[PDB]
Structure formats: C-alpha cells, structure tokens
Design a protein around this ligand. Structure first.
Ligand SMILES: [Cl-]
Ligand SMILES: [Cl-]
Ligand SMILES: [Cl-]
Ligand code: NA
Length: 124
C-alpha cells in the first residue's frame, strides 16, 4: 500500500532524462510506471529534475491549490516537464498519449514530515 509521497514519485518523477525527445515517451512511461494497468490515466505530468529540486518546491512560493486548499507551492524557477494526455482515439487497454515537452513552473501540494510533494496541481 503506497504512501502518498511514494505515489507522487512513481507518477511524476523522471530524473533520468533531461526532456522527452520522442513522440512515444508518454506511451512508454505511462506503461512502465503502471499508470495504464486497469484504466488509461487520462492526464499525467512527468518532471525532469532531481528529486531534491522538486522536494525543495515545498519551501518556495505558497499559493492556493485549485481546490482552494492552501498547502500548494509554486516553483520560483521553471522546470523541464512532459505533459502526457490521452488522445481522442485512445481506449483501454490500448492507451495512447500525446507527448508535449515544455519548461514551466510547477505547482505541487505538500504534506507530512518531512514536508514533501504529494499531489501535482498544475504547471504554469
Ligand atoms: Cl507500481
Ligand atoms: Cl499530473
Ligand atoms: Cl508571499
Ligand atoms: Na507520504
């Protein structure tokens, strides 16, 4: 049974690459992180920075989350991210994703001790 912090890592961290360099990145990564197992997760973002740099966002700019909670933080700097979004022709079990690489600020919700990211709110 996964902790919230571990689930964030599995769903959103890809430090091994600096950026998505292929249109098939999302297809491969959504599968290998087990996000297509029982359903196609419709949207997911991967962050290509070190785990320490992402954890550090919990000490950056405190902002409201989309749901109105106040434990969200926006990174001071932009970060390399990949947005993965199901295509209109995607349907389980043959999940298919569009890969969009960008450099944006990330907004995460933080919780716990240590205070670490548990939810990916948005990128700007
Ligand atoms: Cl897993
Ligand atoms: Cl996401
Ligand atoms: Cl402030
Ligand atoms: Na946790």
């Amino acid at each position: 049974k996964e902790t919230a912090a571990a689930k964030f890592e599995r769903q959103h961290m890809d430090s091994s690459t600096s950026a998505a360099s292929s249109s098939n990145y999302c297809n491969q990564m959504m599968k290998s992180r087990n996000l297509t197992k029982d359903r196609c997760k419709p949207v997911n973002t991967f962050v290509h920075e070190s785990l320490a740099d992402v954890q550090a966002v919990c000490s950056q700019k405190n902002v409201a989350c989309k749901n109105g909670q106040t434990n969200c933080y926006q990174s001071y700097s932009t970060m390399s991210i990949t947005d993965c979004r199901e295509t209109g022709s995607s349907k389980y079990p043959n999940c298919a994703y569009k890969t969009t690489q960008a450099n944006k600020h990330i907004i995460v919700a933080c919780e716990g001790n240590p205070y670490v990211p548990v939810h990916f709110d948005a990128s700007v």
